[PDB]
Ligand binder design. Structure first.
Ligand code: 8IR
Ligand code: ZN
Length: 208
């Protein structure tokens, strides 16, 4: 029961998501190893993901989380990148597919920087790159990110094995560093604690 609502470029909702996409790009200090070399995206399409069951699941959990955290959900709009985007918009996030060796264990990973989530689109460390060219900096193939509604509740701050949130907490927040560049990473351990609200189709742009 997922319906995709194709948003017009003149729509403020489209523009808002587009600006969040572009403004949160950072210069990773890994030469573009994982996600490619770029300053900007070519934004092709933004679709609103409408699924009534997934949404009700999300808000049911958000209530429970809110009650356990002094009537605060600590809800954020965050990026997700992975190879499972098309499954996710249909069936929701699912922590049973999470990877056990993740830095913060077996959860579902989000970012406030679009360009960090772009590093996971093709797998962890960007896997083997795009399917067609095996190129992690591919400028041709179109990528997809989710801009999602995420319930963090009481988030546990963790350094850079773990299966669930620590006792009394509903999420983990990390700030891992790659070369003096530390960026935020948010991790939930329940699929219902995020709703994949917008599907963004895009390319990374070749700089001049
Ligand atoms: C068939 O139905 C399905 C519906 C939803 C999912 C789903 O939520 N997949 C998913 C769950 C967690 C992540 C996730 O955060 N990560 C995974 C996990 C496994 N493989 C690659 N990345 C992850 C782990 C560490 C760092 C970054 C990421 Cl994106 C990425 C994708 C999977 C299947
Ligand atoms: Zn390619």
């Amino acid at each position: 029961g997922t319906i995709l609502i194709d948003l017009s470029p003149d729509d403020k909702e489209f523009q808002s998501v587009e600006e969040e996409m572009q403004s949160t790009v950072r210069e990773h200090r890994d030469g573009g190893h994982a996600g490619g070399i770029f300053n900007r995206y070519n934004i092709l399409k933004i679709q609103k993901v409408c699924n009534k069951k997934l949404w009700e699941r999300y808000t049911h959990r958000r209530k429970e989380v809110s009650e356990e955290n002094h009537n605060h959900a600590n809800e954020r709009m965050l990026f997700h990148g992975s190879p499972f985007v098309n499954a996710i918009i249909h069936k929701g996030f699912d922590e049973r597919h999470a990877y056990i060796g993740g830095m913060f264990g077996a959860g579902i990973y989000f970012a406030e920087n679009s360009s960090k989530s772009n590093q996971y689109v093709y797998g962890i460390g960007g896997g083997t790159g795009c399917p067609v060219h095996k190129d992690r900096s591919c400028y041709i193939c179109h990528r997809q990110l989710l801009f999602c509604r995420v319930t963090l509740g009481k988030s546990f701050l963790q350094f850079s094995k773990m299966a669930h949130s620590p006792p009394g907490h509903h999420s983990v927040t990390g700030r891992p560093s790659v070369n003096g560049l530390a960026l935020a990473e948010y991790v939930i351990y329940r699929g219902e604690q995020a709703y994949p609200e917008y599907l963004i189709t895009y390319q990374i742009m070749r700089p001049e």
